[PDB]
Amino acid sequence: KMAVAESGMGIVEDKVIKNHFASEYIYNAYKDEKTCGVLSEDDTFGTIT
Amino acid sequence: NMLWHKLPKSIYFRRGSLPIALDEVITDGHKRALIVTDRFLFNNGY
Numbered sequence: 001k002m003a004v005a006e007s008g009m010g011i012v013e014d015k016v017i018k019n020h021f022a023s024e025y026i027y028n029a030y031k032d033e034k035t036c037g038v039l040s041e042d043d044t045f046g047t048i049t
Numbered sequence: 050n051m052l053w054h055k056l057p058k059s060i061y062f063r064r065g066s067l068p069i070a071l072d073e074v075i076t077d078g079h080k081r082a083l084i085v086t087d088r089f090l091f092n093n094g095y
Contacts, residue, residue, distance in 0.1 A: 043068065044069060045069075
């Protein structure tokens with residue numbers, strides 16, 4: 001409701017079911033994907049990633 | 050009469066050889082296992 005009064009376009013009823021779709025799809029797939037510290041470990045000869 | 054010379058199929062040996070050979074018995078199809086051990090070699094870390 002605060003981006004419609006300044007910008008001058010858009011309807012208020014459609015910017016509400018688009019702000020909720022780009023904030024829970026991005027907390028349903030990148031929840032458990034390790035990107036810190038250690039990723040994997042194969043120990044046939046010794047390597048880490 | 051006739052003599053012979055029989056042996057196993059394979060003898061892996063050198064310092065640092067246990068975790069690497071055991072990879073060979075899971076790259077082939079083997080799912081279930083069983084172990085035998087003394088009582089002194091179970092309460093410790095062997």
